[PDB]
Each structure stands twice: as structure tokens, then as C-alpha cells.
A = this chain, B = another copy of it.
Amino acid sequence: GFTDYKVADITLAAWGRRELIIAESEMPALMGLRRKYAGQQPLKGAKILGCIHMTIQTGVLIETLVALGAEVRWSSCNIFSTQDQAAAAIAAAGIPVFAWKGETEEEYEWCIEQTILKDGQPWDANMVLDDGGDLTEILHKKYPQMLERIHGITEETTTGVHRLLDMLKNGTLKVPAINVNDSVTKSKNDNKYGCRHSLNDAIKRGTDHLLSGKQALVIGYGDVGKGSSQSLRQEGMIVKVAEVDPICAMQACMDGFEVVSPYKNGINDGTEASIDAALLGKIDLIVTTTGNVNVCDANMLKALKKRAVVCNIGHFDNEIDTAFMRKNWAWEEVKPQVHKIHRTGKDGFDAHNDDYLILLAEGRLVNLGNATGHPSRIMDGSFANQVLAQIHLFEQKYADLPAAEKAKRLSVEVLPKKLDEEVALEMVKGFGGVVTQLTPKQAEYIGVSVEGPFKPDTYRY
């Protein structure tokens, strides 16, 4: 008689389970952790509030934490990223999960609250796993007392790490965190190659547009912008890249992309005259990858070529000024998560109007909203780090320290390189790759242990 959950359709559980069994065969690092730690039950007594896209891959993450002793209460960190069959399989396993594809904003907030509260009272949570910082923020702002029992937060993504570092800088972070994002087997795997796999995937599912031969503008060239640009270039798009960081822009040039600004002289003065209208008027597809605000703004949207596709693969939908489009332009749903935005006005639209844009996932994370996000074998790296980070902070028992000791232990850190390498080795073996072993003479020659780590912490890969 389990009822502590809410999903779209519990009868999808059997399908979800079939895809979970397949995903386990694609996630050797994560499954290897089940075997390595199962006997030791390192998460025995952990009670984890988790907030991250309720996909099949997150299902394998959840069942790994439970297999190692944890109790969890789960929600998705995006209104469109849940795979309903994954949520169903997790619920059917007796695990509290509150998540479905297509939540309203109000439902999204309610779902997080259902993880925080059990039977109307704060759950006795002692760990947090977060993707983007929304659950972290709610706890700090609305349930600060619960943080007195929490040993740490393990944060998945660049945006959530930024929010943690803001708190650390201001002295408002109440518990230590692991920056999972900046393991190399996360940032340079998930953020880059994951978007390479899933960006063109989502655009095809949403529009079925030919990409070869067409013009794309990618805003940003950090890890997601790099992966996104490659997702498009490898399909034969002519990709142009915009950046505010000259080092990232230099990489784009060397990688064979033309670097351009939406604005004359690169100066974003807020006027239509600033827009390079010739450039925007030839762009068939714009993708925002920045984690910044309004990098595809109203004047850019006004200038875009007719029938261009607009999408965002950064964490939050405010990269694109969708608010402007809601206020001024008529939205025509093609199918779920695909809207034609008619620039002729707000008072209805002509069904045969030619002056529209296609917006994907209403501006939300497009790879998860219009497809299934990153593939299992990539998420294997990210989520193996998550499990190790949960063990790392839980075994350190920060919440049991006195305030003076807490002050010394309060930090936002990445996992040690040795763990990063351990994850990477399992990933390589999953491809059938064979890593060479240094001879003692060679290890001595370059000043490393035969067991690693093989690089200093400053190395950038």
C-alpha cells in the first residue's frame, strides 16, 4: 500500500523498468559502485533530498544510492525533463518521487515541497543532491532549520555551483558542498559531449528540420557551447559563435568557427540599431548556452530570419526573452514543447502566416524538453561522481561538528583527482579501451605514481 508519490501514469512502470535494465548495461562506472560499496553500506542512515531531471539515467542514480543504504525523496529540477516511464518505475519500487513531464510552475514548486515534507512535517533529511540549486535555495530560505541536520550538498551543474559560490562568498551557505560539475568526468563529458549528442537530437525530434547547409548562431562557447556547436557542425550546419570571453572565442576560431556578435561593435546598448540585422536575418537556428540572462533578447528575436528555430540548452529559460514573446506575439502550439510564435501580433494569427519563429520547450532546457537529455553512457560519469560525492560528505558528518569546527570545514570543493580518474577508468573500460600501465622508470621520469594521479590539480585537459 505505497502511496507516497505522484507521477503521470504509474502503469508506465514496466516500460520504465525495461529501459532501466538497459541503462544499467550502459553505466558501468555507476553499476561498479553498487558492487564495490554494497557490502559496506556507506549510505546506511543517509536521508537524501534529491532534485534533478527524473530521467531513466537518474533512475539508475537513485537505485544506486538506495542500494548503498540511502533513503531518498525525489523531484525533477525542470518542468519538462521528466521521462514519465522513469518516474513510474521509481514510484513502483516504493521510492517517493514527485515528477511528471509538463508540470506547471506551481506543480514544480509543489513537487519539491513533497520531498521536503513527509506527512506534513519536515523530513529528517541529512543530505541534499541538487541540479541547478532550486532545492538548495528553498532550504536556505524557507526551511533553514533543516540545514542544521544536513551534512552536505552535492551540486550537479554550473549554474547551481555559481549559486553556491555566491552564498559561500556572502557567508550564507550553511553546509558544505561538493561541486560535482567540475570533475573532468562531468564537466568535460556531460556538459560538452552530452550536449553534442542531445542538442541535434532534440531539434530533430521537435522539428524534423534538415540541419545540413543551414546557418546557426550559438551564443556561448564554454563546455555546453562547445558541445552544442559540434552537435550542429557535425550535421553540416554553418555555425557562428558569439562569446563575451576572449579565450573561449579564441578556441572557437581555432575550432573552425566564425566568431560574431549580435551587436555592432559588440556593444549591447538595447536599441534595434545595435542589432547586426544582416547577420540575424540569415540565421536559421539560434541556441543559447550561457547560463546568463537575456542573451537572445527581444531585438534579436525581432531581427531573426523568418521561420528560424530558437532554443536554449542552458539551465534556465531566461536566456531567451520569452516574456517579450508572450506579451507581444501569438503562440500556436504545433505539438507539446513546439510552438510557432507569430510576429504579426498578439490578436490571433493567420494559420498560413509566414512570419513566425519556432520555439522549442518554451525556452527550457531543449535536450531534456524535446528529447531525453544526455545518454546513459555519458550520465554514467556524472552520476558516478554524484554517488562518490554523497559518500564523501556523508562520511564526514559535518552536521555533528561544533560551530567553530564547522566554520573550518565549510567549503565548496571538487572531488579529488584520484576519484575523477577512477570514474574515468571505468568509463574507458566500458568502451573496451585499454589504458597502458607506466613502468616504474617511466613513473619516476615524469614524477607520478604508477597508480596516479597522473596530473597536477592545475591541469586543464
Stretch at the interface among A104-112, A253-261, A397-405: A253-261
Given contacts A266-B434, A435-B249, contact A238 B210 (CB under 8 A): no
Residue A234 at the chain B interface, CB threshold 8 Å: yes
The reply to whether B433 and A258 contact each other, CB–CB distance below 8 Å, is yes
A246 to B433, CA, bound (A): 10
A371 to B200, CA, bound (A): 14
Stretch at the interface among A15-23, A58-66, A142-150, A322-330: A15-23
**Nearest CB of B to A58, in Å:** 13
Residue A372 at the chain B interface, CB threshold 8 Å: yes
A190 to B377, CA, bound (A): 31
Residue A420 at the chain B interface, CB threshold 8 Å: yes
The reply to whether B208 and A375 contact each other, CB–CB distance below 8 Å, is yes
Given contacts A210-B26, A372-B208, A442-B295, contact A425 B246 (CB under 8 A): yes
Residue A445 at the chain B interface, CB threshold 8 Å: yes
The reply to whether A437 and B267 contact each other, CB–CB distance below 8 Å, is yes
Residue A438 at the chain B interface, CB threshold 8 Å: yes
Docked complex: A197-248 residues within 8 A CB-CB of B: 197, 201, 204-205, 207-215, 233-238, 242-248
**Nearest CB of B to A233, in Å:** 8
Stretch at the interface among A2-10, A36-44, A453-461: A453-461
**Nearest CB of B to A440, in Å:** 10
Docked complex: A427-453 residues within 8 A CB-CB of B: 427-428, 431-439, 441-442, 445-447, 452
A22 to B351, CA, bound (A): 10
Residues of B within 8 A of A282 (CB): 432
Q: Which of B185, B208, B238, B427 contacts A256 (CB 8 A)?
A: B238
Q: Which of B205, B207, B246, B352 contacts A421 (CB 8 A)?
A: B246
Q: Please give the count of copies of this chain that the complex contains.
A: 4
The reply to whether B266 and A238 contact each other, CB–CB distance below 8 Å, is no
The reply to whether A446 and B292 contact each other, CB–CB distance below 8 Å, is yes
The reply to whether A21 and B247 contact each other, CB–CB distance below 8 Å, is no
The reply to whether B235 and A197 contact each other, CB–CB distance below 8 Å, is yes
The reply to whether B371 and A250 contact each other, CB–CB distance below 8 Å, is no
A347 to B461, CA, bound (A): 46
| Listed residue (A26, A254, A292) with the most chain B CB atoms within 10 angstroms of its CB | A254
The reply to whether A442 and B292 contact each other, CB–CB distance below 8 Å, is yes
Residues of B within 8 A of A133 (CB): none
**Nearest CB of B to A248, in Å:** 7
Q: Which of B15, B262, B307, B458 contacts A436 (CB 8 A)?
A: B262
Q: Which of B207, B238, B455 contacts A245 (CB 8 A)?
A: B455
Apart from A19-B334, A236-B255: 13 A-B pairs, beta carbons within 8 A: A21-B351, A165-B447, A193-B212, A197-B212, A212-B253, A213-B254, A238-B256, A242-B436, A243-B435, A245-B455, A262-B436, A268-B436, A295-B442
Seen from chain A, the residues whose Cβ lies within 8 Å of a Cβ on chain B are 15, 18-19, 21-22, 25-26, 56, 162, 165-166, 182, 184-185, 187-189, 193, 196-197, 201, 204-205, 207-215, 233-238, 242-263, 265-268, 270, 282, 291-295, 307, 332, 334-335, 340, 351-352, 354, 358, 371-372, 375-378, 381, 420-422, 424-425, 427-428, 431-439, 441-442, 445-447, 452, 454-455, 458, 460-461
